[PDB]
């Protein structure tokens, strides 16, 4: 079962990283295709993906167990814009 | 239509299994 979790964090707007979209199966495949189209970093991390999928529903902010693992993702994925 | 694509376009990172 394929899963994809789309995280959004923008300083000043989102008080915490936000799960803005999720998908399983066909929808997960589509999210990944769109990620490629828009050059959004995609990271494979099976334990984290499964746990996020189960715990943090679409439109929910991440919770404490995820703060650091998601921070690490943001640090590698952030576009520094130069 | 288009909400999915607009969300992905603005997103920060995707985690997958």
């Amino acid at each position: 079962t394929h899963i994809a979790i789309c995280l959004y964090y923008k300083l000043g707007e989102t008080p915490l990283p936000l799960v803005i979209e999720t998908g399983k199966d066909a929808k997960a495949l589509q999210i990944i295709k769109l990620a490629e189209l828009y050059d959004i970093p995609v990271i494979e991390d099976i334990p984290l993906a499964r746990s996020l999928y189960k715990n943090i529903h679409k439109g929910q902010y991440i919770t404490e167990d995820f703060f650091e693992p998601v921070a690490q993702l943001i640090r590698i994925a952030i576009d520094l814009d130069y | 239509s288009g909400s999915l694509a607009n969300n992905i376009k603005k997103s920060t990172v995707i985690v997958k299994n």
Side-chain angles (χ1 to χ4, degrees):
Chain A
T1 301
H2 290 57
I3 52 176
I5 309 293
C6 180
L7 285 153
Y8 177 60
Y9 185 62
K10 188 176 181 213
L11 182 62
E13 183 194 354
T14 53
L16 283 167
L18 183 60
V19 169
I20 196 165
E21 290 286 356
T22 67
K24 80 206 306 145
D25 300 319
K27 187 170 183 203
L29 299 182
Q30 183 184 8
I31 288 171
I32 290 154
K33 289 175 182 181
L34 288 170
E36 177 201 5
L37 181 62
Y38 300 126
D39 296 314
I40 311 298
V42 173
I43 301 181
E44 180 175 310
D45 185 324
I46 293 160
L48 183 58
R50 285 204 293 251
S51 186
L52 283 165
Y53 190 74
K54 191 178 293 180
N55 287 286
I56 312 297
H57 300 157
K58 176 173 183 175
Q60 295 187 337
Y61 294 108
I62 65 169
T63 57
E64 52 174 275
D65 288 351
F66 302 103
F67 288 168
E68 184 57 33
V70 167
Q72 295 178 314
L73 290 170
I74 290 172
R75 289 185 188 280
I76 66 179
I78 61 190
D79 187 1
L80 295 183
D81 224 15
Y82 72 93
Chain B
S1 306
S3 67
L4 174 60
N6 288 330
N7 282 338
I8 304 298
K9 182 168 172 184
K10 74 175 200 187
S11 69
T12 307
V13 62
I14 307 309
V15 193
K16 68 179 285 293
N17 69 342

